[PDB]
Amino acid sequence: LTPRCIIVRAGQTEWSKSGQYTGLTDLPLTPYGEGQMLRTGESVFRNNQFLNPDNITYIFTSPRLRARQTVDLVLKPLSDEQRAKIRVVVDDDLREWEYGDYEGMLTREIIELRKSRGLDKERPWNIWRDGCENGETTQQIGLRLSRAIARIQNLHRKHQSEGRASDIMVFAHGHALRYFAAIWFGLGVQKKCETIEEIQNVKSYDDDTVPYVKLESYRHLVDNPCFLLDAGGIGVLSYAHHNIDEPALELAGPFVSPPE
């Protein structure tokens, strides 16, 4: 089977339901968000079989509690045996956009704050181009997500060459995963790794079974990719023509027609 990257956004939180920007703030899932992530896992493993546990090799997660809680609940339907054959890796490159000054704020409130600081005179604020004051720029996030992508695709290639199926999961956040999905299939711009930041190993994860990939170049966005992904939403990124060098977006998300 063509290897896939299954992306999963953390379930609902107090902020995510009210539209407030959650980055580093370590919010838990609301009680609704736990229920929601439980039913999601039953849907994908049980009532439908969008995911086959035997084919999951790796699960990568943001270190945020809401992401790790989401791994916990979505994987509930698995047996201890299926779990034993799955590796879980906490990766700091998968955290949300660092919002800096905009932590816990709404879009309309961010626009208002920037207006008062004398910004966005010629054109409206666009996070994907502009980033966040005292937070991350679009290249900083595009760089760390590029590193995780290269590790995931290297694993995929290694597994395909060992002749095995490889679904790898990624549990993270609304902005980071939209960004992740966009650059995966080739949106944005290529930049060579030249500066100190672009070239250093930052040691964002610690699992010796995941080879670190030193990038010569990375991708970042300069505009809105125009994606939707709700709390607890599931995307699928794969490859065209069984070829790791042809990374593609799966339009059906996790949906597949039931077998005969």
Residues that bind a second copy (CB under 8 A): 7, 32, 35-37, 39-40, 42-43, 47-48, 50, 177-178, 181, 185-186, 225-230, 232-236, 238, 240, 246-255, 257-260
Q: What's the min distance (Å) between Cβ of 199 and ligand OI7?
A: 28
- Select from Na ion, a second copy, ligand OI7, none the partner in contact with residue 19, using the beta carbon and a kind-dependent cut-off of 5 to 8 Å: ligand OI7
> Pattern 38-77, binding to ligand OI7, x per CB under 6 A?
----------------------------x-----------
How far is Cα 70 from Cα 75, in angstroms, rounded to an integer? Answer: 8
Please classify residue 252 by burial: count the beta carbons closer than 10 Å to its beta carbon, then call 0-12 exposed, 13-18 middle and 19+ buried.
Answer: exposed
Q: Token pair of 78, please?
A: 């698995």
Task: Tell me which of 7, 22, 110, 128 binds Mg ion, using CB under 5 A.
Answer: 22
53 contacts: CB under 8 Å, gap ≥ 6: 45, 78, 79, 82, 86
Q: Is 146 in the site for Mg ion (CB under 5 A)?
A: no
Q: Count CB-CB contacts under 10 A for residue 256.
A: 13
Residues 7-36 touching Na ion, rule: CB under 5 A, are 10, 13-14, 16, 27, 30
Task: Tell me which of 114, 151, 173, 220 binds ligand OI7, using CB under 6 A.
Answer: 173
Q: Count CB-CB contacts under 10 A for residue 221.
A: 22
The residue with its CB nearest to ligand OI7 is: 174
- Select from Na ion, a second copy, Mg ion, none the partner in contact with residue 258, using the beta carbon and a kind-dependent cut-off of 5 to 8 Å: a second copy
Please classify residue 81 by burial: count the beta carbons closer than 10 Å to its beta carbon, then call 0-12 exposed, 13-18 middle and 19+ buried.
Answer: exposed
CA angle in degrees (0–180, nearest 5) for 188-203-96? 45
Residues 195-254 touching Na ion, rule: CB under 5 A, are 211, 231
Q: Token pair of 3, please?
A: 């290897």
Q: Token pair of 249, please?
A: 């977006």
Q: What's the min distance (Å) between Cβ of 48 and ligand OI7?
A: 23
Q: What's the min distance (Å) between Cβ of 223 and a second copy?
A: 9
CA angle in degrees (0–180, nearest 5) for 126-204-194? 65
Q: Is 70 in the site for Mg ion (CB under 5 A)?
A: no
Question: What is 30-70 written as a DSSP string?
Answer: PHHHHHHHHHHHHIIIIIS-S--GGGEEEEEE-SSHHHHHH
Q: Which residues bind ligand OI7 (CB under 6 A)?
A: 9-10, 13, 16, 19, 21-22, 66, 96, 107, 173-175, 240
Interacting residues with Na ion (CB under 5 A): 10, 13-14, 16, 27, 30, 151, 154-155, 211, 231
